[PDB]
Write a protein that binds this DNA or RNA. Structure first.
Ligand SMILES: [Mg+2]
Lengths: 409, 414
DNA sequence: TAATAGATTAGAGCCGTTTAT
RNA sequence: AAACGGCUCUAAUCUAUUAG
């Protein structure tokens, strides 16, 4: 019988220097870590879309509950949480009526650009519209939240049966929480950070996006986008890896006034020896560079024998000194439920390159699962490194990008 | 005195009461609420409302409008209000828009609303507290966090519980002693499909890599006879799995890859003789039981096939052999849908939608029991599944999956 | 060039909204 | 594209071998 190790759940800091483990609970209790004093909304869409967004804004001012208010924390209201007003009376609207629709919304945005975040209300009546719109707004550095009309007014859009196509009745409070957190983060306020951030460790998410031949994208997490298209392999050329690591190290040195004592590169792909020697030839001697590959849906399923509820999140199977399984999903005791449906898929974390303690690596990944600012969730299945790297990479491949994540998420 | 009392509908008004109480404690107010205690109580309540309370709060919701405990606390608070001659001792907290005018309690109506917004209501409550001489301490959100952790998360922590887990991985109990490369130079046709052989076999170089003895493919390949077994290359399977065998003939990683391919092909061939049906997944073959092939569609009290509306779901499994941590078989679980239990639904969209619908309410216990029941249904003997890699050679897959245990767990929700 | 695997990888949809009350 | 998962599907690549 293999012994499981348990990773203690990381805490996330909020306002007044208060740390808890649930972004929703901490936001409702202490308030956002960074306090902005208002959100001026810019709405791009039709009159029906503007009315839908205004109605949703009036609704989200009031408290919104979920079907399960113990499993999913309910929404007290935007001002009751974030201490600032995001109302429909502070709205500037650009009336409307794939590349041409992107141009329509993009022009309607940049002609006016003082809003905090531009809300693109998408009529239901284009698989590249979001990424392209987001990409051509990068050079003009607009923080934008795209909201489908079938999300803010999900009841009003039904199939021929009459039931809503997107059933958000059970997660209405969670939907309000996530939309509020996205708007607040895009308006300039970080709602939480890691409660405990190791000093001198730099976290890099290195993903590859297939341009429709693969573009490598690195996102640095400051507790920093990089891009380069290349051939059809998920590996970095010597000069390419050198440039990536040098840019990441210099960004960290600019932010923290010193080089990291450890650098962890998070990837969904293994690192070959060539790109890792390129990485090592540019890192400082006193900086320990570790290559961590995190794969999803590797066919392991630990089933809790006794009960009907799954393996608790934070349990980790240490296969090797370099390879392990981490349950970033599973039962959350604080939520009294599971972050995933059915049985959770553990993420397989390999220390492919470099030397590091596997327990510390899994602790860092569990901590980084908390910084998903694109979602107001208890924790993410994957660390914010890989998630945000993938978001900004798919955004950049749509065609110097800004370093703030609110322009991609 | 200094205490702040909030009276609320305990079963249903907990969200607002918790938010308001912890917010006020974060603001330095000495808040007394029924939700701020563990293992509690009316004598203590009436005592806090009668003597300790400075300001008395009531969540004026429709559910809390007419409640025994709320009304009792309102009565004792009215007694204290008359005793102290404070015109605003009892402060209604109108939070429910459903509670209509002239429908609230008679005492309450003639007496701050949170219906429009909780921040506006909290600000009005705060400014009312400042207009009167309501005592407060400097804002200490540290004690609000402490109370939240100590009470609201008291039963929602990870405890030092010894927990045991079943896994997806079923150990390979044993392998055939020798992996054999049979040099069927011309006796194996160049265009012959080795996948159609009776036993798993891989063309590897000028040989056939298999666990089968050199004359096992006699029926499929008549020319296999009169083949000398001396030219066959025999490698200890333990050497391959331990990494000991590395030779110019075949690399160790390639040998393990060939062994895994043999394991997968042997499982595929065994499901043919396991009276089970197959379903072509994207990258593998899931294996599901028809309706009527199991007694009451159950194997050892675990339902492996059932009904979903006008459809039939069947718990299917797909197996991939692996050797890295230990020689195991990873068994992914699926739900495979049929029109009547025997006839597969051709459209993959309906299959996927039905899979989502069926897995809605399938949780740890259901997936675990169905996986174990299906694997034991494929069991040949008591604790093993036989994969016939040869006439006299077998690969044994453990009936019981790999067992895990952790020193941390949770109290199961009830 | 094509095929057979095993391994890695990515990308697209699609459905449910995390077992209680 | 609020979002996160669970699944399904389609591909690509690297190996190793074989047929050209
Ligand atoms: Mg977003």
């Amino acid at each position: 019988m293999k012994e499981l190790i348990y990773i203690e759940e990381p805490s996330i800091l909020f306002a007044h220097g208060q740390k808890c483990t649930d972004p929703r609970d901490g936001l409702a209790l202490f308030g956002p870590l960074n306090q902005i004093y208002g959100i001026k909304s810019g709405v791009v869409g039709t009159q029906k879309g503007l009315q839908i967004f205004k109605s949703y804004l009036d609704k989200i001012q009031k408290p919104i509950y979920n079907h399960n208010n113990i499993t999913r924390p309910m929404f007290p209201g935007f001002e009751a949480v974030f201490g600032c007003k995001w109302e429909s009376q502070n709205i500037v609207f650009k009336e409307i009526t794939t590349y041409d629709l992107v141009t329509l919304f993009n022009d309607k945005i940049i002609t006016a650009n003082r809003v905090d975040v531009w809300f693109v209300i998408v009529p239901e009546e284009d698989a590249q519209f979001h990424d392209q719109l987001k990409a051509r707004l990068l050079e003009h550095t607009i923080p934008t939240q795209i909201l489908r009309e079938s999300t803010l007014a999900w009841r009003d859009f039904k199939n021929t049966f009459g039931a809503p196509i997107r059933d958000f009745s059970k997660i209405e409070g969670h939907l309000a929480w996530t939309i509020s957190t996205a708007a607040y983060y895009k308006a300039g306020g970080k709602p939480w950070k890691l409660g405990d951030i190791r000093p001198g460790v730099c976290y890099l998410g290195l993903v590859y996006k297939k341009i429709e031949q693969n573009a490598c994208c690195a996102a640095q997490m400051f507790l920093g986008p990089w891009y380069n298209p290349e051939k059809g392999e998920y590996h970095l050329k010597p000069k390419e890896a050198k440039a990536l690591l040098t840019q990441a190290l210099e960004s960290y040195k600019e932010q923290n006034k010193s080089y990291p004592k450890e650098v962890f590169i998070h990837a969904r792909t293994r690192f070959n020896d060539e790109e890792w020697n390129a990485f090592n030839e540019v890192t400082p001697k006193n900086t320990n560079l570790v290559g961590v590959t995190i794969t999803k849906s590797k066919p392991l399923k630990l089933y809790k024998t006794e009960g009907a509820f799954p393996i608790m999140r934070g349990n980790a199977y240490i296969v090797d000194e370099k390879k392990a399984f981490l349950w970033t999903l599973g039962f959350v005791p604080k939520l009294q439920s599971t972050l995933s449906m059915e049985v959770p898929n553990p993420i397989f974390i390999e220390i492919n390159k470099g030397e590091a303690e596997i327990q510390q690596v899994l602790k860092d990944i569990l901590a980084l699962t908390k910084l998903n600012y694109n979602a107001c969730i208890y924790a993410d299945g994957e660390p914010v490194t890989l998630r945000f790297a993938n978001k900004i990479g798919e955004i950049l491949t749509a065609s110097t990008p800004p370093l703030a994540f609110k322009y991609y998420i | 005195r200094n205490k702040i009392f909030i009276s609320h509908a305990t079963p249903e008004d907990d969200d607002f009461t918790r938010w308001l109480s912890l917010k006020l404690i974060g603001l330095g107010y000495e808040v007394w609420c029924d939700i701020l205690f563990l293992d509690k109580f009316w004598s203590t309540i009436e005592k806090e409302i009668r003597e300790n309370t400075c300001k008395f709060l009531i969540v004026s919701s429709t559910a809390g409008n007419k409640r025994e405990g709320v009304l009792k606390e309102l009565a004792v608070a009215t007694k204290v209000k008359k005793h102290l001659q404070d015109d605003m001792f009892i402060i209604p907290l109108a939070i429910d828009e459903n509670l209509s005018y002239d429908d609230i309690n008679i005492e309450i109506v003639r007496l701050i609303d949170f219906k429009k917004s909780w921040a506006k209501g909290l600000q009005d409550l705060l400014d009312a507290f400042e207009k009167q001489n309501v005592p407060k301490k400097p804002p200490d959100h540290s004690k609000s966090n402490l109370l939240y952790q100590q009470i609201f998360l008291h039963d929602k922590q990870a405890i030092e519980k010894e927990e045991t887990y079943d896994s997806n991985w079923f150990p390979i109990i044993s392998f055939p002693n020798e992996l054999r490369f049979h040099r069927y130079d011309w006796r194996l046709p160049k265009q012959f499909d080795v996948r159609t052989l009776a036993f798993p076999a891989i063309r590897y170089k000028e040989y056939l890599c298999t666990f089968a003895w050199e004359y096992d493919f006699i029926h499929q390949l008549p020319k296999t006879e009169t083949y000398n077994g001396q030219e066959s290359i025999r490698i200890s399977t333990s050497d391959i799995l331990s990494g000991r065998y590395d030779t110019d003939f075949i690399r160790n990683y390639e040998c393990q890859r060939l062994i895994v391919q043999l394991i997968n092909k042997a499982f595929e061939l065994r499901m043919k003789d396991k009276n089970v049906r197959e379903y072509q997944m994207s990258k593998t073959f899931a294996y599901w039981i028809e309706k009527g092939k199991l007694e009451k569609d159950k194997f050892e009290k675990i339902k492996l096939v059932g009904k979903q509306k006008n459809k039939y779901w069947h718990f299917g499994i797909s197996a991939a052999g692996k050797l890295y941590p230990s020689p195991v078989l990873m068994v992914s679980s699926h739900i495979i849908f049929t029109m009547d239990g025997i006839n597969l639904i051709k459209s993959k969209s309906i299959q996927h939608s039905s899979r989502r619908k069926q897995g809605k309410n399938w949780w740890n216990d259901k997936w675990r029991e169905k996986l174990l029941a299906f694997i034991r249904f494929l069991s040949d003997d008591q604790n093993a599944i036989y994969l016939n890699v040869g006439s006299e050679e077998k690969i044994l897959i453990s009936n019981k999956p790999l067992k895990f245990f952790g020193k941390m767990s949770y109290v199961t929700p009830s």
